[PDB]
Structures are given as structure tokens and as C-alpha cells.
From Swiss-Prot:
Pfam families: SBP_bac_1. The gene is malE. One of its GO terms (biological process) is maltodextrin transmembrane transport. It is found in: Periplasm. Its main location: periplasm. Belongs to the bacterial solute-binding protein 1 family. NCBIfam families: PRK09474.1 (NF007011). The complex is composed of two ATP-binding proteins (MalK), two transmembrane proteins (MalG and MalF) and a solute-binding protein (MalE). This is Maltose/maltodextrin-binding periplasmic protein. It comes from the Bacteria. It comes from Escherichia coli O157:H7. Keywords: Periplasm, Signal, Sugar transport, Transport. PROSITE patterns: SBP_BACTERIAL_1 (PS01037).
Length: 370
């Protein structure tokens, strides 16, 4: 079982764990409570294993959508921030950590895709998807293309498809209606048709994937790409003079990317729930706390209003949060699995001609709602 009188924290070792450990040291100095941070390989898979036998870390950091499965297994303790604390973070982030009407984790950071552009090729990036065709023809005259991004995964194609009305699962009253899927409505059809038309008109290639798109942008062959905060470092090394901004609109409406929320949950079997809450609320989710974590490894945008306003001074972070706020929270229900499979196939089939847009989405909708 977990030891009382101390805190063990788990988080992927590639994130700012050193920062969390520093906040832990500060905690130990003020309370005498030792905080040990660990980053086991595949800790996300190990948590349910050790948590089952009443073992594991007191606190676990991971993406919100995954906490859904954890909460269904009752592995997470319900957190109870007072209204004063909840007001410290952006409202939409609390929605990401709510399971069956209960709050099961503290939101930490927010990730979402943004439009990334080459400032030398396009000092002023386009605000609309509609302009992409004309922009590409202009750039092609100079041996450059307008846009290249991963068309193989729903995470990257969904922003446009959802813009005019598409959606995964209808969210209402803090609950997802698994029988109300918006994959084959008029909005989704319009979005995918535009995407497919771009391919038919040679402005994009159906085979472009993550690596192909990243190489093209980082080598200055294409003026724009679509990616997240995790791709910036690779661009920094390429020396490309890039900018990060709000995604283009479609039919005057904002692209809606899925939003991922790094969250901190408390082990249901932890005998240190009170101290765990004190650490997270009064030490980590503070400007100094998040700053320590962010300096170790960039968090992207954060859920804490006060610190996000500071980080937002970086236009890349401001763009990340803007797209996140206009986006769709990644559903934390098991049905998203079918949604991902279904939509990935639908997009590939429509982009290749194997199916029309209407047929591809109709089949995806059917499967998802089965
Ligand atoms: Zn033990
Ligand atoms: Zn590790
Ligand atoms: Zn995840
Ligand atoms: Zn992550």
C-alpha cells in the first residue's frame, strides 16, 4: 500500500518533472512532507495495475481523456476545489476533468493545434480556408506551396470538418450523448468536401503525413502547416522564421481542434488526499509553481488564468489558447475509440476517391452510433 506522511507523484518523464520536484522541495520545506517524483516507463499503463492493489503514486499526471477510464474504475478520488479556487482556472478546463458529474482531477496545461506559418513567405497569414486555393496558385508560381499538414489522422483533419457543424458527441449538462454523433451532418459534409476539393485541385496531396508535412515546412518548401506546441522545437532548429496563429475559419466560422488537457489526479487509495490537495492547489497551481514546471519543459498554454496571461505574452502560446477555446474538448468516453477509427477511414476513403464524401461520413456515423 501507499505510505502515509509523504507524497509520490507520477508524470511522463519527458514533461517538466524536474519542475514538479522543485515545487515538491518547496513543499517539503514548508510542511516537512517529502515529495518524490517518478517517471516509470509506460506509467499510464502501470497506474491501473498498482492502483488496483492499493499501491502506486499519490498523484498522477496525464491527459484528461484517459482519466475517464480511470474514473470508471474508481481509481481516482473526487476532488473538491471550492468555488474560489475553481475561478482561478479557465471554465472550459474543468469540463475536461469532470466524469459523471464529478470532478476527478486538476487541469494543468492545455494543448491544441494552431496554424504555423513561414513569416518570410507570408508576413501576414490567411485568416480563411477559402483563400488556400488562390494562395497556393500564387505561391506555386514561386516554386512554393501554400499548405501541408498531416491528413492521415482525425486530430489534424477534424478542425476543418467540425468548423461548419461537425462534432464527435453532443455535450450537454456535463454529459456526452453517445447516440448523438455529428459526423454525417451538413456541417461535417461541407468541411470534408472542402478538404477533398483541395486535394482534387492539387493544393494538397492525399498521402501527406506528419513527417512529410514537417519536413516540407521546416525546409521552407511550404508556407504553412498545422501542428501543436510539441513541434516548435524542431522548427527552432531549422531556423525557419515562423509564427503561430489562430487556425483559418471556414464559412466564417472558426476551425475547431480537439483540446487535450494535462491533468493531475489523486489516487483513490491514497492515505494522503489532504496533503495531495494542498500541494496541487496551494503549491503547483500557482504562478511560481507552473513557472518552475514550464521552465523545465514548456507546458504550452495553462489552465491557471493568472499565469496563462503571463505566458500569453508569447504569441505562440496566445494562439494555442485561442484555438483551444474555440475548439472541442477531447471526449473522455470509451466511444471516442470508434470515432477515431471511423473518421480516420472516412477521411482517407474520401481523399482517395474510394468513397464519396457523403458515403464515407455516412458509414462512419453508422459505425460510431452502433
Ligand atoms: Zn507499501
Ligand atoms: Zn522515466
Ligand atoms: Zn492522451
Ligand atoms: Zn502529453
Amino acid at each position: 500500500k501507499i505510505e502515509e506522511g509523504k507524497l509520490v507523484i507520477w508524470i511522463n518523464g519527458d514533461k517538466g518533472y524536474n519542475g514538479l520536484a522543485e515545487v515538491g522541495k518547496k513543499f517539503e520545506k514548508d510542511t516537512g512532507i517529502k515529495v518524490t517524483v517518478e517517471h516509470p516507463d509506460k506509467l499510464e499503463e502501470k497506474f491501473p495495475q498498482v492502483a488496483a492493489t492499493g499501491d502506486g503514486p499519490d498523484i498522477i499526471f496525464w491527459h484528461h481523456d484517459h482519466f475517464g477510464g480511470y474514473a470508471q474504475s474508481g481509481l481516482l478520488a473526487e476532488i473538491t476545489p471550492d468555488k474560489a479556487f475553481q475561478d482561478k482556472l479557465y471554465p472550459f478546463t474543468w469540463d475536461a476533468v469532470r466524469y459523471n458529474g464529478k470532478l476527478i482531477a486538476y487541469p494543468i496545461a492545455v494543448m491544441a493545434l494552431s496554424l504555423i506559418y513561414n513569416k518570410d513567405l507570408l508576413p501576414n497569414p490567411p485568416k480563411t480556408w477559402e483563400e488556400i486555393p488562390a494562395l497556393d496558385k500564387e505561391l506555386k508560381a514561386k516554386g512554393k506551396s501554400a499548405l501541408m499538414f498531416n491528413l492521415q489522422e482525425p486530430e489534424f483533419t477534424w478542425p476543418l470538418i467540425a468548423a461548419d457543424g461537425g462534432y464527435a458527441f453532443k455535450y450537454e449538462n456535463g454529459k456526452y450523448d453517445i447516440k448523438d454523433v455529428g459526423v454525417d451532418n451538413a456541417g461535417a459534409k461541407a468541411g470534408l468536401t472542402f478538404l477533398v476539393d483541395l486535394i482534387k485541385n492539387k493544393h494538397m496531396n492525399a498521402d501527406t503525413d506528419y513527417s512529410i508535412a514537417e519536413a516540407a515546412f521546416n525546409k521552407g518548401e511550404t508556407a504553412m502547416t498545422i501542428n501543436g506546441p510539441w513541434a516548435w522545437s524542431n522548427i527552432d532548429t531549422s531556423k525557419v522564421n515562423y509564427g503561430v496563429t489562430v487556425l483559418p475559419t471556414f464559412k466564417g466560422q472558426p476551425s475547431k481542434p480537439f483540446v487535450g488537457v494535462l491533468s493531475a489526479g489523486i489516487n483513490a487509495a491514497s492515505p494522503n488526499k489532504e496533503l495531495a490537495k494542498e500541494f496541487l492547489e496551494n503549491y503547483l497551481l500557482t504562478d511560481e509553481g507552473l513557472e518552475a514546471v514550464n521552465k523545465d519543459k514548456p507546458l504550452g498554454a495553462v489552465a491557471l488564468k493568472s499565469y496563462e496571461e503571463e505566458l500569453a505574452k508569447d504569441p505562440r502560446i496566445a494562439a494555442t489558447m485561442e484555438n483551444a477555446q474555440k475548439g472541442e474538448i477531447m471526449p473522455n468516453i470509451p466511444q471516442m475509440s470508434a470515432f477515431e477509427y471511423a473518421v480516420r477511414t472516412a477521411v482517407i476513403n474520401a481523399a482517395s476517391g474510394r468513397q464519396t464524401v457523403d458515403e464515407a461520413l455516412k458509414d462512419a456515423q453508422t459505425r460510431i452510433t452502433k
